[PDB]
C-alpha cells in the first residue's frame, strides 16, 4: 500500500543525510525536492527529516547566503556532527542558480511538530540564521530595487523548467531550448557570477508568480519562527510588507488570473499555468479573488480527468504528457490544495488530494501524470511524490 | 447603434489631441474626463488615446507636479512632437485645483494593451515620472502629516460637485452655493496658492472617500507600471501601505458603509453616496465588507429602477434629477461594477453594466440619468459616457 | 426589565467618576471593566461615560504611559475639574501589571457619537495623547524587538485569569495557582519593575491572542481618532502594519484556529479558547479564515446550549462553571459578535447577542454563565454585563 511503498522509495533514494529525487540518479541533492522530501521523512524518522535540510545548508550554502538548486555531492553524507568547525572537510561543487524557496515553510513545520522539543529548538536555532541569509540573498541579488518581487534569471529556477510561460522570454536568449539554457549559464560564468551584472545583463529576467508566491509564504513562516525563537524579525517584516504588494500586483483582472511578468519585454506573460494558483498558498488574495481562482480550477476540471494540470487544458500550449506543459504534479497539487483549504474551498482541496492519491495508488510514485489518462510519466521512484503521499496522509 | 454613435461623439468633441467633455463647450480639457475618454479612444486609434493624456500632462502639469482639473487651452492642440524642449511654445492658463487621479490606472491599461509595444514603452516611460510627480504633489500638498489620506479643499475636487456629503462642510465657508465655491477660490489666491497655508487655513477640508479610493487604485497601478518598466517604486510603496490603512479607516461599522470625513468638524460625514462604493475599485475591503456593500447596493435597487444612484434613494437628500444628488452616472457605474466583479459579485457587476448600457441606448450619451425614469440629463454628447460605452463593450 | 435594571446596577456600583466591577467590592477601578462600562453609561449620561475614562487615566497612568489593571482608589472620585495641575492632589496606589487595551476603541465611539460636539472634541483631545502613551508603553515594554506582537508577563494581564491556555506556562513558574500568581508579582518587585529585566527574566511570557487582537483593534481606532483630530499618526501606523503581520501569524492552519504563543517554551499553545475568535474584532483575517472560525463557533454550539463558551466544549479542560474554563462571558460575546457581523456572519452575530441577552434576562447581571444550564455565576450586579446589555440594545 501507499505509505509503506512510499517509505521504500525514500529509503532506496537515501544517500545518508540527503535523498536523491528519483530512482537511477547520481548522488546529487536538489533544493526544492529536499524540502518536500523532509516532510515525508517526518512520517519515518524526525532526525532524518532534519538531517535532509541540515545537509542541504551545510554542504550547499555560500558565504553570501545563496542556496543552489543542486549540490553535487558525488557520495553519501553522514549526519551533521554538531559544532563541524574544528576539522577540515570537503565542500562539494554546486550549481550557480537557485530554486523555489519552500524551505522555511518546511522548517517551521519541523520545528512546531517535532515531539522532541529539545531537538526542535537546537535544529531550528541552527537553521534560522541560514534561512534568513538565504532570503536575504534572494532579495539583495534578485530584487536590488526593493520592489518586493524577485526575478529568476534562468527558467530552471522556477522549478517548472519548460513551463509554456517561459517560451517567449527564452526565445530572446542569444545562442533548441537546451542551447538557450546553456547559453544563459555561459553568460553567468562569463560575468563571474556577479549578481549586479547578471541582474543588469541577463537576457532572461522574469518575475515568476510561483517562485514569488512560495517565497512570500516562506517569509510569513520565517517570521513566525523568528517570533517563536525570540530572534529579531526586522528584515523579514520588510520582505513581508513589500511582498504582499508585489504578489498581488501580478493579478490580471481582465484574465481573472495571476501571471508571471517578463521584465525584459516589460509585459505580463499572458499564459495561465498551475503556478498562478500559488498565491493562495502565500495567503495574499482576498476571498473574491480566491473564488475566481476556484472557478477557474473547476473550469480546468471540465476538460481534464485529474486536477491540477500544469497548464490550462484549453491553452494552445497544453500537451498532456510533456513535463510542465499540461501534466499533473504532486507537489503543486499539494501546495494549491493547502491554499484552497485556507480560503474555505474544502471540496476543491479534497479533490486535489483525492486526485493526487489516486494517481499514486494506480501508477506508483512518478514525476508527473497525464491529466487525461492518468498515465505516470518521467522519473521512477520519484521522491517528492512519495514524500507528499506520506505527509498528506499523516 | 451604440459604438458607432459613441465614436461620432468623441470625434465631434475632439480638439486635436484633447477631447472636450460635452457638446457645446469651449475648447478646455478636464482631468478626470480625459482619463475616461482615453479609454474610449482605445477602440478607435491607440495613438489618439495616448495623445489625450500626453496633452493633459504636457500643457497641464506644473513644476511641482500638480495636475489641474481644467486646462484652459482656448484652441485645438497638435500631437506631442516628441523630445518639444527646443522651440518656444505657449503654456495655457489652468485651474488651481485638482480632480480624482484615475489617470495612472488608465495609463497602465494603455501600456499593457497597446498592440504596438515600442509605442507603449515610449509613451509609458515618458508619462511614468509625470504620474509619479502628480501622486507626489497630492501626498505632499494634501497629506502633509503622512496619514495615508489626502484632503480636498474644494467640493469640485471630488468630481462630485454638489454631492449631499459636502452640504454641511460647504455651509461653514464664509462669504447660494456658487458664492461659497467662489469664496474658496478667492481664499486660495489670497494665500498665493501656498499649499502649506491653504491646508492650514481652508474652511473646507474633507477626506473624500471617492478621491481617496481612486488614488489608492491608481497607486496600485502606478506600482505595477514601475515594476514592469524597471523604475524605482520606493515612493509608491509608501503611499500604498499608508493608503491601505487610511481608506479602510473610513468604514463605519454601525452604518455598514464608507463615509467621507470632515476634518474641519473632525467628524465622519454620515451621508451614503455612490462614492462610498469606490473602495471596491481600490481593492481594500475584505470580502465580508464587500458583501455588506453588495447588500446595500441591492437595497438601493429596491427603490431605483436603474443602478447606481449617486445617493441612497431613501436619503432625505435624494433628488432624482439633480447632478450628484441622486442621478446615475456612467463613470461611477463602471468603476463600481469593476470593483464588484473583482470581489466575485458577478451578477451585481453585470446589472450595473446592463443599466448603464440601456440608459445610453435609450437616451444617448448624457451626463447623468434619472434613476426612477431613466431620463437623460445634463450635458449632451457627453464624452465619458460615450467613451465608457466603447470601453465597456470592447 | 433589562435596561432599567442595568442602569440600577451601574448607579449602585458608581463611586462618583468610576464604577466598581460588581456588587460588594472595595472602591477600586479596573482597566478593561471601566472601558466596557463607559459604553453602558452612554445610555444614561454622556459626561458620566467620559468621566469613567478620564478617572482611569487621571489617577491610573504613570509618566511612562503605563495603565495598570487596578487603580486602588479607596474612595469615591469627583469629576475631572479641568486644567488639575494647579492644586496638590492624592495619587492612589495602582497594580504593577496591565490588562487588555480596549480603551481606544471605546474612546473613538464616545468621540464619534457624543451629541455634544464641543465636549467630544475637548475630551478626545485630552485623552488622545494619553492613549497614545499607553499603546507606546505596551509596545516599548512588551515588544522591545518590534515584532508587532506584545507579551503578557502574568496570566491576569489577559483578563482571562485561569484560561486553560495558561496552564502549562503557569506550571513553569518557580514558587496552587495563587502561589504562582504571587511569585510572579514578587519577581517583578524584586526586579524594581524594570521592563527590560522583567521581559528578559519573567518565567511567564506569552503572546496572548486576545490581548493582541484587542490591541490591534484599538490601534486601528486610535489611528482613526488621530486623523479626525488632525493629530500626528506616525507611531500608530507602525504598530498597525507590524500588528497585522503579527496577529495573522497566530493562525494555526492544521487546527483551523488562532492560538496564543508561549515564548518561554517557544511553542504555540494548542488550546482553543474564546480569545482565538477575537482577531475577527481586530479585522485581520481574510473571509475564508473568518468562515473557518464561523464553522468552529457553530460546532461549539452543537455541544453548548449558550454561545460562546470560553473554551471548546470538547476540550479536556472544559468545565461549565469555572470562570474562564468553559463559561460564557458577556464582554467576549459582544466583541466576537461585533467581529462576526463585520465579516458578514449576521446570523451567528445575532445568536451571540440573543444568547447574551437571554442569559441576562433570566439570571440578571452576573460575571459568567454556565453554557449548558445557563446558570449565572461569579460576581453579582456585574457591571460590564449590565453595561453591555445597555450598549448592545441601544
Ligand atoms: O527532480 C529534480 C528537478 O527535476 C526537474 O528539473 C523538475 O522540473 C524540477 O522541479 C526538480 O526540482
Ligand atoms: O465634465 C466636466 C466636469 O463637469 C462637472 O463639473 C462634473 O460634475 C465633473 O465630474 C466633470 O469632471
Ligand atoms: O472584574 C474585574 C476582573 O475580575 C476578574 O479578574 C476577571 O477575570 C477580569 O477579566 C476582570 O477584569
Ligand atoms: Cl477577504
TrEMBL record, chains A, B, C:
Residue stretches spanning the membrane: none
Entry-linked Pfam families: MGH1-like_GH
GO biological process terms, semicolon-separated: oligosaccharide metabolic process; protein N-linked glycosylation
GO molecular function list: Glc3Man9GlcNAc2 oligosaccharide glucosidase activity
Domain Mannosylglycerate hydrolase MGH1-like glycoside hydrolase: 26-385
Entry keyword set: Glycosidase, Hydrolase
Entry similarity comment: Belongs to the glycosyl hydrolase 63 family.
Name by which UniProt lists this protein: Mannosylglycerate hydrolase MGH1-like glycoside hydrolase domain-containing protein
Annotated organism of origin: Thermus thermophilus (strain ATCC 27634 / DSM 579 / HB8)
